[PDB]
Structure 1
């Protein structure tokens, strides 16, 4: 059962990708799934439903006017405006798939999206000041969403999984999401609702398939999925966030996954890839695939 979930960010969010300074307006589904796992382990909940049957998407912008989806990567027949274009409204998605959108219309769509304003917060660390030292400045990138806008996502699973995810989101509203939490970022309010429009759009039979999340398949599915398919690799990496993995903070094994919006003619499934490097527990990374049918 696909269930729309909208997040309204009271406070600015970090959502970092490679550094603390940079800020992304969205995060891949792997970050959301890791946050859900952390919250479930904090609440002593069961991880059987999350690991087995829970196919979620990335976080996607939504505005006061209409919801948005990642731009499918298909050939366009100036092109700089198309390449700069990143998100397409749900109503214009079919038009873009047919190619009816032109360069001027693509630029107007790019200007139409109003998520929020990104900015840089210059903070310091004064811990060395009293120890005969000096303050250390650093920067945190924060993207403050517009009052109307927010970040939505879709999650497909059984009713028990939907209820467990409802509880997890109720806890995440205060636990926070993204990066630099406990320092004034990541606080949000959730709203889980049924969406008829997304149900209609997902329930289609197109000739191509578009990825709505950062996904990667096993060896055989990868063998029979890359044929004449346009994609983009994202380097999912970082450190491990837990108090029961190692005595120090160590990085996890580097992972690579296709970006959301990549078009694959053959539909491949995904698995929760394990990126634990000889640790006490297994640091998971979400790589399941949420597919959207499309016509070109």
Structure 2
């Protein structure tokens, strides 16, 4: 809920289920498992787990930071002059792949805003090899930033959090970390009044998730009865240290960021630990929100 931690990367590799593609934002499982694994390099896993299983803190996945705030498009929420078909049928193709908005007219967006999406942080693809090997053309996609864009996870400003966040500067946060990707730089700022007021968690109103969520099994039906969202398949392999193996996780289908709702719910830390594996696999999804019009 509290102040947000700006992270400018310049070299990112952000998943999207494959290796040849890459997102721009990282769905808040990556930053959570980076704080978790970074705690285990010091033996400090138990302290962050004691913080983690209690609901004082929050999180929020990445969004573009170009001199301030960008937020998701309310997914499926621009609410429905119905003539001049060369415009009002045409602009829906240029207002569906927009997905990131500025705060200073995010309440003018819901009333109807153009929003030419600026080309911040173009996704690149660069080919790479392995010499003297059989198959070597693995195409490393790379999310390359436009010299001002940052990502800014929003959480409770904790010192156990900030030790981890100032170790992740040099740990890397992305796919191909030891190949030199995902190394950000961290500089915490404040929040505007028009964002930190709206970071609710229990307001029974037309509200939008600002991170990839998953409800209580009781709350899931009433979440889906009002939700306009996507799923976007939180998946991938499990990174442990006592395996000599590489096991897949349990295919958690999240409620991806931009998930608008009404009567907001209580998220959870859904264990997707592999079947008969030593330690649990946390896979954070509890949502910090944004009131649409309130």
TM-score (norm: length of structure 1) = 0.87
Matches within 5 A, 1:208-219: 208-219=206-217
Structure 1 residue 81: Cα displacement: 1.7
Q: Mean alpha-carbon deviation: is it higher for 196-205 or for 184-193? A: 196-205
Q: Tell me the secondary structure at the aligned position of residue 227 of structure 2.
A: coil
Q: CA deviation at 1:188?
A: 1.0
Call closer, same or farther: CA 1:188–1:228 in 2, change over 3 Å: closer
Deviation at 1:268, TM superposition (A): 0.4
Unaligned runs of 5+ in 1: none
CA distance in 2, matches of 1:186, 1:75: 33
Partner of 1:51: 53
Residues 1:135 and 1:259: Cα distance change in structure 2 (over 3 Å): closer
Deviation at 1:16, TM superposition (A): 1.3
Alignment of 1:170 onto 2:166: yes
* Separation in structure 1 between the aligned mates of residue 204 and residue 3 of structure 2, nearest angstrom: 22
Identify the match of residue 81 of structure 1 among 73, 81, 94: 94
Match of 2:123 in 1: 118
Number of residue equivalences? 276
Cα displacement (A) at 1:194: 2.3
Runs of 4+ residues over 6 Å off in structure 1: 203-206
Structure 1 residues 80-89 or 45-54, which shifts more? 45-54
Tell me how far apart the structure 2 counterparts of residues 227 and 135 of structure 1 sit (CA, whole Å): 48
> In 2, Cα distance between the equivalents of 1:248 and 1:228?
42
Q: Which residue of 2 aligns with 1:243?
A: 241
Are the counterparts in 2 of residues 239 and 250 from structure 1 also a CA contact under 8 Å?
A: yes
| Separation in structure 1 between the aligned mates of residue 209 and residue 200 of structure 2, nearest angstrom | 14
Name the structure where strand makes up a greater proportion of residues: 1
2:280 counterpart SS class? coil
| Whole-angstrom CA distance in 2 between matches of 1:44 and 1:194 | 31
Cα pair 2:200 2:289 within 8 Å, conserved = no
RMSD of aligned Cα (Å) = 2.0
- Structure 1 residues 224 and 176, CA, compared in 2 at 3 Å: closer, same or farther? same
* Counterpart in the other structure of 1:61: 64
Match status 1:180 vs 2:185:
no
**What runs of 5+ residues in structure 2 fail to find an aligned partner?**
81-90
Match of 1:150 in 2: 150
TM-score (normalised: structure 2): 0.88
CA contact (8 A) 1:115 1:150 kept: no
CA distance in 2 between counterparts of 1:196 and 1:75 reads: 23
**What is the correspondence of 1:17-56 to structure 2 with a 5 Å cutoff?**
17-45=16-44, 46=47, 47-53=49-55, 54-56=57-59
Contact 1:166 1:192 in 2 (8 A): no
* Aligned-partner Cα distance in 2 for 1:238–1:94: 36
Asked whether the equivalents of residues 8 and 188 of structure 1 are also in contact (C-alpha less than 8 Å), the reply is: yes
Higher helix share: 1
Using the TM superposition, give the Cα deviation of residue 100 of structure 1 relative to its aligned residue in structure 2, in angstroms: 2.8
CA–CA distance in structure 2, aligned partners of residues 201 and 260 of structure 1: 16
Corresponding residue for residue 90 of structure 1: 103
Alignment deviations for residues 165-187 of structure 1 (CA, whole Å, 9 cap, x no partner): 11101100001101100101111
What's the offset of the Cα at 1:193?
Answer: 2.5
Which of residues 284, 287, 292 in structure 1 aligns to 2:285?
A: 287
Per the alignment, residue 138 of structure 1 pairs with: 138
2:269 aligned to 257, 272, 281, which one? 272
